[PDB]
Structures are given as structure tokens and as C-alpha cells.
Design a protein around this motif. Structure first.
Motif, PDB file in Angstrom:
ATOM      1  N   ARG A   1      52.286  20.859  62.913  1.00  0.00           N
ATOM      2  CA  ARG A   1      53.081  22.086  62.784  1.00  0.00           C
ATOM      3  C   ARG A   1      53.192  22.325  61.282  1.00  0.00           C
ATOM      4  NH1 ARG A   1      58.329  20.517  66.496  1.00  0.00           N
ATOM      5  NH2 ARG A   1      58.099  18.687  65.125  1.00  0.00           N
ATOM      6  N   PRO A   2      52.050  22.497  60.606  1.00  0.00           N
ATOM      7  CA  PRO A   2      52.011  22.723  59.161  1.00  0.00           C
ATOM      8  C   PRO A   2      53.074  23.713  58.692  1.00  0.00           C
ATOM      9  CG  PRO A   2      49.817  22.604  60.047  1.00  0.00           C
ATOM     10  CD  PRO A   2      50.738  22.788  61.210  1.00  0.00           C
ATOM     11  N   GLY A   3      53.935  23.269  57.781  1.00  0.00           N
ATOM     12  CA  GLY A   3      54.974  24.138  57.259  1.00  0.00           C
ATOM     13  C   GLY A   3      56.184  24.400  58.142  1.00  0.00           C
TER      14      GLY A   3
ATOM     15  N   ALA B   1      46.683  25.596  57.673  1.00  0.00           N
ATOM     16  CA  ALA B   1      47.663  26.413  58.375  1.00  0.00           C
ATOM     17  C   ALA B   1      47.693  26.196  59.879  1.00  0.00           C
ATOM     18  CB  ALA B   1      47.410  27.896  58.067  1.00  0.00           C
ATOM     19  N   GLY B   2      46.530  25.957  60.472  1.00  0.00           N
ATOM     20  CA  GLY B   2      46.458  25.776  61.911  1.00  0.00           C
ATOM     21  C   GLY B   2      47.029  24.491  62.483  1.00  0.00           C
ATOM     22  N   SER B   3      47.424  24.567  63.752  1.00  0.00           N
ATOM     23  CA  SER B   3      47.984  23.437  64.473  1.00  0.00           C
ATOM     24  C   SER B   3      46.888  22.693  65.235  1.00  0.00           C
ATOM     25  CB  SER B   3      49.046  23.926  65.464  1.00  0.00           C
ATOM     26  OG  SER B   3      49.221  22.998  66.524  1.00  0.00           O
ATOM     27  N   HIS B   4      46.814  21.379  65.033  1.00  0.00           N
ATOM     28  CA  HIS B   4      45.820  20.549  65.706  1.00  0.00           C
ATOM     29  C   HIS B   4      46.439  19.379  66.463  1.00  0.00           C
ATOM     30  CE1 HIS B   4      43.266  22.812  62.934  1.00  0.00           C
ATOM     31  NE2 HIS B   4      42.279  22.546  63.770  1.00  0.00           N
ATOM     32  N   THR B   5      45.688  18.850  67.428  1.00  0.00           N
ATOM     33  CA  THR B   5      46.165  17.759  68.255  1.00  0.00           C
ATOM     34  C   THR B   5      45.368  16.464  68.183  1.00  0.00           C
ATOM     35  OG1 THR B   5      46.948  19.392  69.845  1.00  0.00           O
ATOM     36  CG2 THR B   5      46.864  17.091  70.558  1.00  0.00           C
TER      37      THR B   5
END
Lengths: 100, 9, 274
Positions: C14-16, C90-94
Motif C-alpha cells: 500500500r505504497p504511501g 505507486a502500484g499495489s502488489h502481492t
């Protein structure tokens, strides 16, 4: 970046019987990413006494969660599950069928 | 019981 | 019968917005016994099975410490993996991880496994021999090379062939009362007219444990696997599971169909005819 739309099953913990408290379940599975919105509706309006199991996943890495809440099935009261997910353009609703 | 630590990828 | 202990770990960046969301869960067969959720107030490994309370204060301290170490590793990895695949920050990764061990009816080691995935796809896994790795792509190769030099396989093997089994037995004993129990399914069949000349037969299996089960329809004793609807085995929320399988049949020919229920809780499979 892959994406899997959620499968949905709405049902009760025990065999439905009007007047007797039970548990309304909404089991969502096979989805990805994990971010997901799930609400249990009583006559169209959402319930807030809702809970869910801890996030887990299957062998294919797809996630699954169980949303549930205590309740008492009646003849006039209608229930369903409202699920929203990135792969969904429109929140999906699945009414609760006693024989499923 | 869990592994005592998991090495970074 | 056979048994397994398995841990599942999920980290979502959850960058930022905040620390990545970290959720871990532990299972003995189909019974969850512990959980950790980075958004929870305790910030400790928590109990999810009655019998786990038999463990002492040092258990909770140790598992909390270890599970936080897993979280920290997942956090670093999210960064590492983002780089490997040259993705934006910026994107959310799993990141998902699963490992555990299987023991036979004598409770002796049968097999071990350690799997790791990135964004829902295999990234790297420990092969069956517990000495080599299956690297999904070029990115995984770098990790494979790292983990060989750092002798990760050796660490996992020692844990999987020892510690994992040792604790699984321990949990199996403490939870004997319930973990070694088999709840045979309560079954019934529903007959509901659909068309004008067709009827639907739904075979139900309820209140059973473990979740492993098989529902198969036959006509005249021959498997009918291409006119049926099978649902994913689902949790009842009380520890048991449910499932059903249906088939549309010609009205008047129902007596030809049979539903076969296979579940270790049954001395022999059940045959149901409407």
C-alpha cells in the motif's frame, strides 16, 4: 498482472427454519487481488454486525473469505450478498436461496 | 510452530 | 489417517498509504489454530483453535516474534520484487507464501513443501526432494541463485523434516479430542421440477469434517459427469463443511440416477437414490 473474478455462494450454517436463529454466510473465493468489498443485505439494506474469517488462499493462489452474521430467517425477510471487486464493473448481488 | 526466520528473496 | 500442518502468508503493498497489510494463518488439516493480522490491536500471534491455549506464555512470545520476522521479510521482498520486474512504486502488489508438512497415520514425515508467489503466480518453490528449486522465470533465477549460496534449502529441510513434524504431533495430541475426529456427512436429496418434462436432483452433504469429500452422479451405475453442476466445498462457519451436486434428468427416469458420497468419515461410500 492477473485478475480473477470472485465466485459467490450465499447460504446458512444450519438448515433454515423460520423463527430460529442461524448464521447467514457469504463465501467468496477464487479472486485476485485480495482487495474486495462484501456486504450481507437484509431487505436491500446492509447489515453491520458482519464478520469475516482471516484472509487465506487456495493452491492456485486465489483468495477466499467467509463473511457471516447471526440472524433469524423469516417468510417476509429477504437476504443476499453484495460483492464488489476490481474485476467487477457492477457490484454483484446474490440472493439467498434456501435450497442452495 | 513457525520457521524461526525466512530469508529475503 | 494422514495429517498436515500448513502456514499461509499474504502481504499486500500500500505504497504511501501505510505498511503493507500482512495476514498469516496456521492450520492443522482443515482446522485453523493461529492468526496474525497487522491491522489488529494485539500485534501478537493470536489463537483460533481452543486446544492451542494449552501452549504456554513462551509460545505466544516466540510465535509473535517469529511471525513479525516473516512480515519484515515480506516487506523487504515487496521492494526487491518491484525492482526485479521494473515496476512503479505507486502500484499495489502481492506476495503469498505457503509451507508445511505431511505425516502419515503413524505421524511420521511423508512430505514437506515451501511455495512463494508474486501477484498470484508461481515465483519460486522448493521441489519435492527439498534440495532444489523451481524458478518460474528469469527473476526467480536470481532468487534461486541467492538461496543456493545461502543454503536456504538446508534450513527448510531441517525444519520440514524435524520441527514441523514434531509440532504437528504435539498439536495433534493436544487437540486429539477434535482434530482426530471425523464428522461423517449428513446427506439428503432434493427433487424439484424444472422443465415440463425434466426434474432436478440435488445431492447434499452437510456437517462433515475434514473438508475432503467426493460427490458423483451415476446413471445405471455409470458416472455422469457432463450434465451436472458441482459447487465448491464451502465452510459452514462452525468448523464443518458443505457441498452439493446436482443433475437435470428426464422426469420419470429418476430411479436410474444415484449419488455417491465418499468421505473418510464413512465406513463405505453412500449410495443415494431419490
Amino acid at each position: 498482472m492477473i485478475q480473477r473474478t470472485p465466485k459467490i455462494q450465499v447460504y446458512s450454517r444450519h438448515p433454515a427454519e423460520n423463527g430460529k436463529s442461524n448464521f447467514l454466510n457469504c463465501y467468496v473465493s477464487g479472486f485476485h487481488p485480495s482487495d474486495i468489498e462484501v456486504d450481507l443485505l437484509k431487505n436491500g439494506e446492509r447489515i453491520e454486525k458482519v464478520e469475516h474469517s482471516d484472509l487465506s488462499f487456495s493452491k492456485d493462489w486465489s483468495f477466499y473469505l467467509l463473511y457471516y452474521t447471526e440472524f433469524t430467517p423469516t417468510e417476509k425477510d429477504e437476504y443476499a450478498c453484495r460483492v464488489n471487486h476490481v474485476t467487477l464493473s457492477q457490484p454483484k448481488i446474490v440472493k439467498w436461496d434456501r435450497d442452495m | 510452530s513457525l520457521l524461526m526466520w525466512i530469508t529475503q528473496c | 489417517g494422514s495429517h498436515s500442518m500448513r502456514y499461509f502468508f499474504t502481504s499486500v503493498s500500500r505504497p504511501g498509504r501505510g505498511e503493507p497489510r500482512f495476514i498469516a494463518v496456521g492450520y492443522v488439516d482443515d482446522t485453523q489454530f493461529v492468526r496474525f493480522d497487522s491491522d489488529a490491536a494485539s500485534q501478537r500471534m493470536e489463537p483460533r483453535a481452543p486446544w492451542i491455549e494449552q501452549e504456554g506464555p513462551e509460545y505466544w512470545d516466540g510465535e509473535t516474534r517469529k511471525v513479525k520476522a516473516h512480515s519484515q521479510t515480506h516487506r523487504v521482498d515487496l521492494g526487491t520484487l518491484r525492482g526485479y520486474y521494473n515496476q512503479s512504486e505507486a502500484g499495489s502488489h502481492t506476495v503469498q507464501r505457503m509451507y508445511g508438512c505431511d505425516v502419515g497415520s503413524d505421524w511420521r514425515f511423508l512430505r514437506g513443501y515451501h511455495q512463494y508467489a508474486y501477484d498470484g503466480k508461481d515465483y519460486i518453490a522448493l521441489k519435492e526432494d527439498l534440495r532444489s528449486w523451481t524458478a518460474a522465470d528469469m527473476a526467480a533465477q536470481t532468487t534461486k541463485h541467492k538461496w543456493e549460496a545461502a543454503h536456504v534449502a538446508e534450513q527448510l529441510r531441517a525444519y520440514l523434516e524435524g520441527t514441523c513434524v514434531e509440532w504437528l504431533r504435539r498439536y495433534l495430541e493436544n487437540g486429539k479430542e477434535t482434530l482426530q475426529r471425523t464428522d461423517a456427512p449428513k446427506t439428503h436429496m432434493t427433487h424439484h421440477a424444472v422443465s415440463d418434462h425434466e426434474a432436478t436432483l440435488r445431492c447434499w452433504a452437510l456437517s462433515f469434517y475434514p473438508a475432503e469429500i467426493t460427490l458423483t452422479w451415476q446413471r445405471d451405475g455409470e458416472d455422469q459427469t457432463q450434465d451436472t453442476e458441482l459447487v465448491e466445498t464451502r465452510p459452514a462457519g462452525d468448523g464443518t463443511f458443505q457441498k452439493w451436486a446436482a443433475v437435470v434428468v428426464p422426469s420419470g427416469q429418476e430411479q436410474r440416477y444415484t449419488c455417491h458420497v465418499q468421505h473418510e468419515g464413512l465406513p463405505k461410500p453412500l449410495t443415494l437414490r431419490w
